[PDB]
Write a protein that binds this DNA or RNA. Structure first.
Lengths: 190, 73, 232, 179
RNA sequence: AGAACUGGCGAUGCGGGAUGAACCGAACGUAGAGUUAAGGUGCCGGAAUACACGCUCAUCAGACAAAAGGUGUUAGUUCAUCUAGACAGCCGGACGGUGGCCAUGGAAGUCGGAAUCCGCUAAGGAGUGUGUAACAACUCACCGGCCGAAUGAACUA
RNA sequence: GCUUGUGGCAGUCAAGCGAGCGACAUUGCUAUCAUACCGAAGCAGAAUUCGGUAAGCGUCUAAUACCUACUGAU
């Protein structure tokens, strides 16, 4: 009903620091730095004690107010990724054809290869987004560990990896071959 | 073709590793998909969807009333 | 609009409302003047069969339970609201589950009964494991191999997805048998139990942790005095 | 159900023919529309009257398509005995057919079939679910009798299945006459 | 459709409606000044992109198919409780005859048939669901612990 | 401000309006053909059913649902 003012509070630990200006946002921390553009969100930021950041919307409706909470959520996610980071345990399984996963740097660009899926001779590649690192899990068979700072980039890379290898024109209930996300967590063990 | 193998195959190897997550997300997206369909599907398809939704709502109301009446006794 | 509707199913039971709370409030006052002594138990969690066993073995001393605020209001949060002299003292002391146990037995009987009594229970989160439990390097079992595997039936495959997607353990299914690629040490003595670890232990039925209810405060209906003891 | 389907089809044909023969004498557009609605509604009611037989046909179709395709005329061998005395393992090792051997009585609830070649001659084997009346027992008896195949009775000298030898002997004697 | 009704048209110019006989205005000689009706005041097109209160994101909005649906949006009516802890969210309890009685190869809450009680707890359905050949195992609805104020259901605009 | 898919009605329902009516169910005899891209289905494969986008192209085979304009040339 045309709220006079609504706001949310963002908490930033001493391990990270941020600088706020026009909606281009800067974040720095032990794991590196991240940036995001929110000029289309039309929200105002306000610092109080260098550890709490206030985001407020004036005369904004429910539809507009909904972006206020999402801005705080994105800021918190970026801070957590910069501090702790996100590690995704990607697992692939098969029954007859051993799925082959390889990493290449064709034309400089890093790519993740998938081969031998259900005997398919086609070569599948997925570009590695910036900030994402790939390494084979230890003491775990047929596991790929995607690691990175940006939540969106790592999540999109994992989704592309698990979704490009679709089972096509086959019994989904029976053909279990494929790649799926097995667990979502943080790089830092804590 | 021999038997109910698919059930046996599911028991012996299970469904897709993400099958539970896929089903849960599909079920949870139906709430918004129903609204999108109500705001879409022009033509006779809209008429059919509206009639089906009205019938489902009437059946739900009848079931609720029957349960409430029998709940007391 | 846009508000999500509450999920509803036609269950066989309905809500109780504030009628039960008011009834308990009245009953607390009606029973305070009957029993000679009143106690409050800091029973964090008690299995219903265990509570029923305690009640039947202690039925002579009726037990009263309910919401903390309701019971404190019935007993009185201050002197001006106390039903009897010094009654409000135990109301402030209690912090966890009420466990308002009215009894006609003196302090000696109550403390002896609560010291001798002891029962086993699952290890809850934030506690330390009372035993060591390592799953074998192959097919898993209902009890996790803590008992001879010749009689421990393998875990039902239907529950494998829950372990795979919630407990994060490297469980896999081979010909309908749940198997892991290494002997995962879910818990060890001295290790703080996580929520997932507690759930895993409950699934395996490893109730090795001991449990015994403790009394927080004491009140006398004829001496107008209140005492607190740490005896469990 | 088949007769009901046929009768519904015949009634639909008759109604359509009659309404074609009847609609030719309409005058107004609404009269023709009402007659068309009459024919369509009669067809719809006839179809809806088959709501139960349609579901029954769907269910029976879903199951018939997965039944084993055995040939009674060709040489074949039948294995029979008390429920899961061990014949399940025998089938699991004599042919590629994968069947469990769990200790409980009715480990198999269908006539599992497997094929093998002896002296380059095609042979098929059928695993009887079990014999104690019941539908499963009747199916096993019919398979034993009608099929032009020998029957391999199974017994247990050990305590497997928790059944004594006397019970197996009694069952064999009871079913002996017809095989 | 049977008529009576009073007006427009016929014998009617003119202004507005993008151009019409069923609409609105309108007492028709030749010129000058000033004020109006309908109709308008973004340009074509003479006149404020005037003031102020709210509504709408609409893949032909806008200048009789309709009774309903939409987790579209903005306002009210009737029932709900609420600092004895509103709604939601995270944990725990979630019993005992009982594996109730029949249905039987095997089903104990969940394959079917009817009963659906007392005993007790702040709270337990002879079980609202998931699942096992059958027990098991998870879960609601019923409460308790944490958390600190408005929320839950149907209707009128 | 025409047209498109569920035969009239006796009783049972009867949400709601307000004396009397009446939705949705029910007993009574009675604008894609194929190619292209996706979702569901006892979808093992093959083959096939239903549902959506798509008018680009075809429709025994994969399938056979007297003056202005005009192309040309000064």
């Amino acid at each position: 009903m045309k709220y006079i003012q609504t706001e949310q509070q963002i908490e930033v630990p001493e391990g990270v620091t941020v600088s706020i200006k026009s909606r281009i946002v800067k974040v720095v921390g032990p794991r590196g730095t991240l940036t995001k553009n929110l000029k289309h969100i039309d929200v105002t930021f306000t610092k109080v004690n260098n550890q709490l950041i206030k985001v407020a919307v004036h005369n904004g409706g429910r539809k507009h107010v909904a972006a206020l909470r999402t801005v705080k959520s994105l800021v918190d996610n970026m801070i957590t990724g910069v501090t702790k980071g996100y590690k995704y345990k990607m697992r692939y399984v098969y029954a007859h054809f051993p799925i082959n996963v390889n990493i290449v740097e064709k034309d400089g660009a890093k790519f993740i290869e998938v081969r031998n899926f259900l005997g398919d001779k086609k070569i599948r590649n997925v570009p590695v987004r910036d900030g994402v690192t790939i390494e084979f899990s230890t003491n775990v068979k047929d596991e790929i560990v995607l690691s990175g700072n940006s939540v969106e980039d790592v999540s999109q890379n994992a989704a592309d990896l698990q979704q490009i290898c679709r089972v096509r024109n086959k019994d989904i209930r029976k053909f279990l071959d494929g790649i799926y996300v097995s667990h979502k967590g943080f790089i830092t063990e804590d | 073709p021999q038997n109910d193998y698919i059930e046996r195959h599911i028991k012996q190897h299970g469904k897709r590793l993400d099958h539970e997550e896929r089903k849960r997300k599909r079920e949870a997206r139906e709430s918004h998909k129903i609204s999108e369909r109500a705001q879409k599907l022009t033509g006779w398809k809209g008429k059919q969807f509206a009639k089906k939704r009205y019938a489902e709502k009437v059946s739900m109301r009848k079931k609720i009333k029957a349960h409430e009446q029998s709940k007391v006794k | 609009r846009s508000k999500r509707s509450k999920l509803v199913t036609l269950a066989q039971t309905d809500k109780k409302g504030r009628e039960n709370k008011e009834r308990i409030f009245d009953e607390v006052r009606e029973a305070l003047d009957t029993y000679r002594y009143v106690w409050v138990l800091h029973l964090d969690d008690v299995r219903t069969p265990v509570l029923q066993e305690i009640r039947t073995s202690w039925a002579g001393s009726k037990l009263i339970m309910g919401k903390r605020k309701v019971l404190q209001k019935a007993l009185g949060e201050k002197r001006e609201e106390e039903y009897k002299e010094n009654l409000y003292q135990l109301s402030k002391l209690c912090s966890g589950v009420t466990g308002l146990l009215f009894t006609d037995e003196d302090v000696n009987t109550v403390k002896e009964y609560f010291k001798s009594y002891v029962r086993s229970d699952y290890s809850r989160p934030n506690t330390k494991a009372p035993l060591t439990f390592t799953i074998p390097e192959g097919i898993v079992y209902s009890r996790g191999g803590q008992i001879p595997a010749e009689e421990d039936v393998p875990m039902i495959h239907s529950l494998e997805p829950t372990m795979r997607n919630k407990f994060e353990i490297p469980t896999k299914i081979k010909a309908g048998k749940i198997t892991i690629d290494s002997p995962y040490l879910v818990c060890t003595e001295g290790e703080k139990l996580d929520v997932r670890q507690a759930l895993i232990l409950k699934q395996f039925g490893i109730a090795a942790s001991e449990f015994k209810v403790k009394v927080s405060a004491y009140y006398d209906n004829d001496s107008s005095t209140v005492e607190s003891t740490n005896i469990n | 159900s088949l007769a009901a389907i046929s009768r519904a089809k015949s009634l639909v044909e008759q109604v359509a023919r009659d309404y074609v023969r009847l609609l030719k004498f309409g005058q107004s557009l609404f009269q023709c529309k009402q007659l068309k609605r009459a024919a369509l509604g009669r067809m719809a009611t006839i179809v809806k009257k088959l709501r139960d037989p349609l579901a029954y046909l769907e269910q029976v179709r879903q199951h018939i398509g997965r039944l084993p395709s055995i040939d009674p005329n060709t040489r074949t061998l039948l294995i029979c005995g008390y429920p899961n005395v061990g014949k399940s393992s025998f089938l699991r090792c004599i042919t590629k057919s994968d069947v469990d051997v769990q200790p409980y009585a009715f480990t198999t609830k269908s006539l599992y079939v497997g094929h093998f070649d002896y002296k380059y001659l095609r042979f098929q084997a059928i695993d009887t679910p079990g014999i104690l009346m019941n539908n499963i027992e009747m199916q096993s008896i019919y398979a034993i009798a009608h099929l032009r195949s020998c029957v391999l009775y199974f017994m247990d000298l050990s305590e497997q299945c928790g059944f004594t030898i006397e019970a197996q002997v009694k069952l064999f004697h009871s079913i002996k006459p017809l095989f």
